[PDB]
């Protein structure tokens with residue numbers, strides 16, 4: 001069956017691990033344990049196709065193998081949004097391509113201390129020709145949509 005190699009990237013503390021664990025294990029990780037590098041694998045049916053998701057959860061604290069990249073910032077962390085650009089460039093680097101499957105994810109959308117407005121992230125994603133999706137690893141809002149949207153982007157390339 002098809003295997004989709006997904007890589008989750010973004011600054012430290014934005015919720016990459018919480019998002020992946022909510023998707024794969026269906027619970028919210030409340031504590032903050034910085035990641036070095038972890039992998040998750042799960043067989044799922046996406047749009048009627050049985051497939052294997054292979055998800056690499058990377059370190060944000062200061063790749064070339066992935067088929068699509070989930071680029072995460074937190075909507076209450078303006079710096080993590082400004083850091084997105086640096087990840088967009090590293091991805092071009094490690095893939096040696098200018099047209100990589102990516103999805104921009106604004107996480108922690110359950111929080112009210114918002115400093116990145118939806119329209120600003122929509123504009124960033126627009127400029128790279130990719131979707132913008134907001135998520136909450138805490139409430140599960142948008143979580144499946146973000147990862148499945150990345151699979152649907154990979155299928156387009």
Ligand SMILES: Nc1nc2c(ncn2[C@@H]2O[C@H](COP(=O)(O)OP(=O)(O)NP(=O)(O)O)[C@@H](O)[C@H]2O)c(=O)[nH]1
Pocket residue numbers: 010011012013014015016017018019029030031032033034035036058059060061107108109110111135136137138139
């Ligand atoms: N309210 C809220 N908190 C969240 C959300 N996602 C993650 N968090 C919290 O933010 C903290 C950091 O989450 P974590 O997933 O470890 O971040 P990370 O991006 O994997 N960090 P690292 O790059 O160091 O591995 C944790 O306390 C976690 O509970 C979310 O959607 N909402």
Ligand SMILES: [Ca+2]
Pocket residue numbers: 002003004005067
């Ligand atoms: Ca594959």
Ligand SMILES: [Ca+2]
Pocket residue numbers: 027028029030
């Ligand atoms: Ca918990």
Ligand SMILES: [Mg+2]
Pocket residue numbers: 016017018033034035057058059060
């Ligand atoms: Mg982590």
Ligand SMILES: [Mg+2]
Pocket residue numbers: 115
């Ligand atoms: Mg502002």
Ligand code: NA
Pocket residue numbers: 092093094095096
């Ligand atoms: Na390269």
